[PDB]
Amino acid sequence: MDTEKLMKAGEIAKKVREKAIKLARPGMLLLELAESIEKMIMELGGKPAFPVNLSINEIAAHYTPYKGDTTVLKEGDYLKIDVGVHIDGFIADTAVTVRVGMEEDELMEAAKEALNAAISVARAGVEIKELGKAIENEIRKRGFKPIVNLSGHKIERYKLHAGISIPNIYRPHDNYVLKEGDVFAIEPFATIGAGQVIEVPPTLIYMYVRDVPVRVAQARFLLAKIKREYGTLPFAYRWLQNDMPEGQLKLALKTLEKAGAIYGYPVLKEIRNGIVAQFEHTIIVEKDSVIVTQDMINKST
């Protein structure tokens, strides 16, 4: 059922996340890491909810390797491993920051404790603004800044971002009350920069939006492909690299973007190039003591 499938996605996400952390050592090629992770997900009976994100230092999110990517992990690098798994549409979304070859530092602890404080107050009947306050307080109290344009989000079947979000700053009108059964991802983002991310090249992730008319055949068929293979879930440029020539692929995606058929999600980096840390868990809201699907499994595997 619902809960069962969700917890199952959570269990897989957890195993996959731990393995990634163990593989995230100096010299490790990002492409190999992303591949191993997505492979483990399928062999465990699940499917990726989106391409595994591996964002380093000032890159906050939306970075997933591509065939030919020579990028490798370096000691001291602040690697954000964001993995998502779904079972029949029920999504588990989790993330961690690892400082390659080193222990967690103050900045990383800020994001992790912000997440703990948010889960501590997150329960049925509480307004979202309360989580934002708790998150903002932990980050600023420790001397860092929260990212104002990246945060948590409601999750629904086959819908990574259901609409309602969980800010990392307190907003007086976030009066939305968490209901039992609600599925939310809480993602505190802390930085030493300004506290805002900007889009920058290249675009490695895309998502299907609408079924608009496309005159260009190659683009029109790429859309029909995307629509049925990925549906409403994010996909990686990497996942399509062996389908058609790089050149043609790049132009077909661009056409779909301008046509408004799909949305491109380029790399997000801190505006002042500030190091970014992130931690995330998916939880099921319940009358007090919410369940953390990506913790130790406590609902219905």
**Residues 292 and 17 sit within 8 Å (Cβ to Cβ):** no
Choose the one of its own copies, Co ion, none that binds residue 123, judging by a C-beta under 5 to 8 angstroms depending on kind: none
How many whole angstroms separate alpha carbon 8 and alpha carbon 20?
18
Q: Strands 235-236 and 47-48: what pairing? A: unpaired
Query: Taking CB under 5 A as the rule, does residue 38 contact Co ion?
Result: no
Considering only residues 161-180, where is the footprint of its own copies by CB under 8 A? 161, 163-165, 167, 169-176
Query: Taking CB under 5 A as the rule, does residue 49 contact Co ion?
Result: no
Query: Taking CB under 8 A as the rule, does residue 125 contact its own copies?
Result: yes
**Active-site position among 11, 38, 58, 280:** 280
Choose the one of its own copies, Co ion, none that binds residue 163, judging by a C-beta under 5 to 8 angstroms depending on kind: its own copies
| Greatest Cα-to-Cα distance within the chain, rounded to the nearest angstrom | 55
The residue among 38 and 187 lying less far from Co ion, judged by its C-beta, is 187
Decide if 82 is catalytic.
Answer: yes
**Residues 276 and 57 sit within 8 Å (Cβ to Cβ):** yes
**Residues 123 and 288 sit within 8 Å (Cβ to Cβ):** yes
The region that residue 25 occupies, defined by phi over 0 for left and psi between -120 and 50 for alpha, beta otherwise, is beta
**Residues 14 and 294 sit within 8 Å (Cβ to Cβ):** yes
The residue among 145 and 154 lying less far from Co ion, judged by its C-beta, is 154
**Residues 262 and 253 sit within 8 Å (Cβ to Cβ):** yes
Would you give the binding string for Co ion spanning residues 173-202, x where CB under 5 A is met? ------------x-x---------------
Element of type H or E holding 207 = strand 205-208
Can you give the length of the chain in residues? 301
Closest approach, Cβ 2 to Co ion, in A, equals 19
**Active-site position among 11, 82, 182, 270:** 82
How many whole angstroms separate alpha carbon 266 and alpha carbon 257?
12
Candidate residues 54, 150, 192, 226; the one interacting with its own copies per rule CB under 8 A: 150
Which among 23, 46, 47 has a CA at the least distance from the CA of 34? 23
Candidate residues 94, 97, 191, 196; the one interacting with its own copies per rule CB under 8 A: 196
Would you give the binding string for its own copies spanning residues 229-268, x where CB under 8 A is met? ----------------------------------x-x--x
The residue among 34 and 60 lying less far from its own copies, judged by its C-beta, is 60
Q: Would you say 281 is a known binding-site residue?
A: no
Which among 94, 52, 88 has a CA at the least distance from the CA of 239? 52
Q: Strands 262-264 and 276-278: what pairing? A: unpaired
Decide if 280 is catalytic.
Answer: yes
Task: Please calculate the CA angle 104-285-90 and round it to the nearest 5 degrees.
Answer: 85
The residues of the shown chain that bind Co ion, judged by CB under 5 A, are 82, 93, 95, 185, 187, 280
Binding residue ranges for a divalent metal cation: 82, 93, 153, 187, 280
The residues of the shown chain that bind its own copies, judged by CB under 8 A, are 62, 125, 127, 148-151, 153, 161, 163-165, 167, 169-176, 196-197, 199, 209-210, 263, 265, 268
Q: Which residues are catalytic?
A: 82, 93, 153, 161, 187, 280
